[PDB]
Design a binder for this molecule. Sequence first.
Ligand SMILES: CC(=O)SCCNC(=O)CCNC(=O)[C@H](O)C(C)(C)COP(=O)(O)OP(=O)(O)OC[C@H]1O[C@@H](n2cnc3c(N)ncnc32)[C@H](O)[C@@H]1OP(=O)(O)O
Ligand SMILES: CC(=O)SCCNC(=O)CCNC(=O)[C@H](O)C(C)(C)COP(=O)(O)OP(=O)(O)OC[C@H]1O[C@@H](n2cnc3c(N)ncnc32)[C@H](O)[C@@H]1OP(=O)(O)O
Ligand SMILES: CC(=O)SCCNC(=O)CCNC(=O)[C@H](O)C(C)(C)COP(=O)(O)OP(=O)(O)OC[C@H]1O[C@@H](n2cnc3c(N)ncnc32)[C@H](O)[C@@H]1OP(=O)(O)O
Ligand SMILES: O=C([O-])CC(=O)C(=O)O
Ligand SMILES: O=C([O-])CC(=O)C(=O)O
Ligand SMILES: O=C([O-])CC(=O)C(=O)O
Lengths: 157, 184, 273, 273
Amino acid sequence: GKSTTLFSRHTKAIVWGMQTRAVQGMLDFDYVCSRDEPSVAAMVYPFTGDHKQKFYWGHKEILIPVFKNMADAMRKHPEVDVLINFASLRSAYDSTMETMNYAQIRTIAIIAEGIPEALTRKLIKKADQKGVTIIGPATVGGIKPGCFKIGNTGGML
Amino acid sequence: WARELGLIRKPASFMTSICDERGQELIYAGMPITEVFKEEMGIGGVLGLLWFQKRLPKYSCQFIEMCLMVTADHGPAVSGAHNTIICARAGKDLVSSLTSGLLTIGDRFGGALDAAAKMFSKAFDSGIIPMEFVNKMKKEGKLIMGIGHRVKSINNPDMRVQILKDYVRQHFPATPLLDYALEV
Amino acid sequence: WARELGLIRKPASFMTSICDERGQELIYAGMPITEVFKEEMGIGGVLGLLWFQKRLPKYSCQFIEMCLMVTADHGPAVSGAHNTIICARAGKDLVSSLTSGLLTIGDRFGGALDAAAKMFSKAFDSGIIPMEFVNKMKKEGKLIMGIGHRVKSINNPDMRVQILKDYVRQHFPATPLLDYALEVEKITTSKKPNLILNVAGLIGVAFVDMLRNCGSFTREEADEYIDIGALNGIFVLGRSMGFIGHYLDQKRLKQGLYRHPWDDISYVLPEHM
Amino acid sequence: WARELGLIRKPASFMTSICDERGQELIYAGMPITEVFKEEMGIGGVLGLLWFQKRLPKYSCQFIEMCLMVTADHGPAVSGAHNTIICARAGKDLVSSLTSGLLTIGDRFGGALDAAAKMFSKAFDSGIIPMEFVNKMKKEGKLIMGIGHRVKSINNPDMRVQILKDYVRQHFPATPLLDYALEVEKITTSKKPNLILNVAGLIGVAFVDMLRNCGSFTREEADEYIDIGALNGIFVLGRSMGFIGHYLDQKRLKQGLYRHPWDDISYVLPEHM
Ligand SMILES: CC(=O)SCCNC(=O)CCNC(=O)[C@H](O)C(C)(C)COP(=O)(O)OP(=O)(O)OC[C@H]1O[C@@H](n2cnc3c(N)ncnc32)[C@H](O)[C@@H]1OP(=O)(O)O
Ligand SMILES: CC(=O)SCCNC(=O)CCNC(=O)[C@H](O)C(C)(C)COP(=O)(O)OP(=O)(O)OC[C@H]1O[C@@H](n2cnc3c(N)ncnc32)[C@H](O)[C@@H]1OP(=O)(O)O
Ligand SMILES: CC(=O)SCCNC(=O)CCNC(=O)[C@H](O)C(C)(C)COP(=O)(O)OP(=O)(O)OC[C@H]1O[C@@H](n2cnc3c(N)ncnc32)[C@H](O)[C@@H]1OP(=O)(O)O
Ligand SMILES: O=C([O-])CC(=O)C(=O)O
Ligand SMILES: O=C([O-])CC(=O)C(=O)O
Ligand SMILES: O=C([O-])CC(=O)C(=O)O
């Protein structure tokens, strides 16, 4: 089943891809929303080893883990309930299919444009089977003022 | 005196085949220095003689010279130039500063040459098509070495790749690996 | 002025956790230098603080000091000491000569520490018995790192392996990898006498045992420190003393520029290239 | 075979007097390694044997150990630590990174030890009073090496100068050059408070005092060892610990390749050459 409240002030998201500007904008949005914790718990980038990337929490300096594989990211962060996918039209399908293998993810945001309609229909079918809400591809995402922000929605700070 | 008479045996502990300092004339891998200068090779010819012990064609030596020219410097922001400048501003030495800068040449900095060459040679020798090579690199979590730029993409190319590529196209007899890399 | 007011944001490009130069007092990994000297640690304690950010026990620091002492020098015939002497006889510099000598520290020279430690750690973690480890090394065309000596075999041991081994036996709480290496040494000495645990192999296994047997490190931390080359640093720091001593000896003896004799070099240049 | 029979003559091309690798036991400047460990010296004793070929007293070796401890590291902002970190973040090597950091040790960075020692030794041997030395340095356009600090002046001293100075006062038999340097320090602090004896200057004067005040060395030997750069080796060996610690820290933190920001570099290239 698909829930009604996709995002809250405690929502934790995993970002697929090396998008430092989008994650920093998300963190700035969280800080100006008086959130207790950043909305991004970890990042997934398959073309590098696991490490820590440096980000800003207001003026404080924080570290966000970056994992090569989805499995490690979901293992170390069971509190993550949202995936924001910054994969290309040639990788969004496989990454979303791999993500829907983890039950903790209830909402998936796909930013890529140009995905074939058949692959998108397969994604929709699997999401409906798993009860996972998908913000359709070729979108900036969404904004919930005070709770959560997806990707680059709403521009800069 | 015993060695001159051939009375004793002492094996040589070192081997060399690139330069013969002894004798009436200096020799670069079997070639006299006067003959080196008369044949009108430059840095490329001497480099070929000293590194490969081969008499390279004129276009090969010129291409080596172009490769040395285009890799001469890339600003002070790179790790090696930064280290050289740090050691120079300490007033240490020319040799020490250049050495400190060169010690950063390795995998992350200055190693894209050998890494790209090895990757493309392995791909070409494996017999896989460029699309198969790209897919294999993608599924292995590896980025293709020697592919990708920061600002210059198309209709505004490197201006260092273009000159070398034009020289290779005009002068090299056959460029199979270059064509494979261009398809990639 | 803008940073003081907190008006702008500029991320720091560097990270450090081993030394705090700023402030009223110098700090070594969270410990003041005055407290460092009051706790009566020496080179071993400062090395532990700077390299592992840990307050090592007294026996661990003393063992690190012994490891530095035994790897201080091994004569001028080794590649590193030879290069240091060559650069010193050219009248270059202390730093340049020591650096030229240290640049030979690698796989063939000075790398038996880390190689032996990694091999024995992999064998011990794989769960294979020492005989199985010896057979696996033999069938893979690999020689066991840290095993084998030139003259000293038995009834006349290294006299550097013995001191460190006695210290480790008396002071280390548990030495599983050292016992595994000693069983491997027994098996290798059952083949030919000079196949004993080297100073490099003994130091490697005892350093792994110290890392993963003291309460300072978890298993992951010890494995990471072994992987990143802590024993390479141990050997380099130990041998730097001998390299500087060699430079000072060559500058005191006032030795001239060295040139290798031509009779010792075989010239195999091609006929004409 | 001909050399064994004594039939031929071949002069040796190298000389060494600090370590004897051949034989049944390793020897450090005439002393067996087992006897080295039984006499209970540490890094200081082995350093003295390898660098000066002398059996130094216990306090001299301990003072050498303290000098190595206090020069271990001074943060990552110095040129050498910066270069070591740059080479480490390039993922090159432990040896390469430490070497790149050490290659900055010279006149401007890490040479205040030898420079201060030489200046104070020349002043003391010239027979001039400390005030005359200060005036001579002032009129020559030269700043006194080893004098001056950044924040710590008085009622808040170095906390590294204090420990070494207390040890030298308690344990050294005679400290003429240290007293001369302290009078110079009083004169300089009479000008502005932060003109105190630096760690470099204090270590230099105390090392000269140890060399020419212990019974191991004659005056000529101490002068020669100061001239050839024994304190340069002291500083390099001390700071190598911090450089290796910085390399290990950077490899543990898994820092990527560094590239200097363009906004921090001023480009003054000519119009067209
Ligand atoms: C030696 C060579 O020719 S490069 C060989 C490198 N090896 C490879 O080819 C492996 C595969 N390629 C890759 O790794 C990647 O595709 C790269 C690194 C080549 C592509 O570069 P990117 O990932 O875009 O990072 P890049 O180096 O461009 O840096 C990003 C930006 O910082 C800027 N920048 C670069 N150096 C500096 C500096 N010192 N200070 C400030 N800004 C800088 C660039 O202008 C660049 O501009 P952008 O914002 O428009 O992208
Ligand atoms: C750092 C260390 O403690 S050593 C670590 C080395 N790494 C390993 O342990 C890997 C496994 N071990 C091995 O590779 C081998 O078992 C070795 C090299 C350790 C054993 O040594 P060997 O193969 O016997 O060669 P070795 O070094 O003894 O040299 C042979 C002889 O030359 C002599 N020799 C050594 N150095 C010199 C020199 N500079 N000049 C002249 N003769 C020399 C030796 O006395 C030795 O005597 P021998 O004829 O009685 O054997
Ligand atoms: C190895 C040693 O012990 S020191 C070497 C010995 N050399 C000598 O003694 C030679 C003679 N002495 C001198 O040259 C001078 O008297 C000095 C350099 C020792 C005195 O230092 P100063 O001239 O005051 O310059 P200093 O190094 O303090 O730098 C100035 C300020 O920058 C600050 N600063 C130092 N390093 C950094 C850094 N990496 N980043 C930002 N700020 C820094 C300092 O806190 C200092 O504080 P201040 O503003 O209160 O003065
Ligand atoms: O040349 C480039 O584009 C990459 C670079 O900075 C270098 O290694 O010189
Ligand atoms: O110590 C040994 O026996 C091996 C050696 O020569 C060295 O690397 O120092
Ligand atoms: O120690 C000091 O005060 C000066 C310094 O930065 C160094 O060379 O280590």
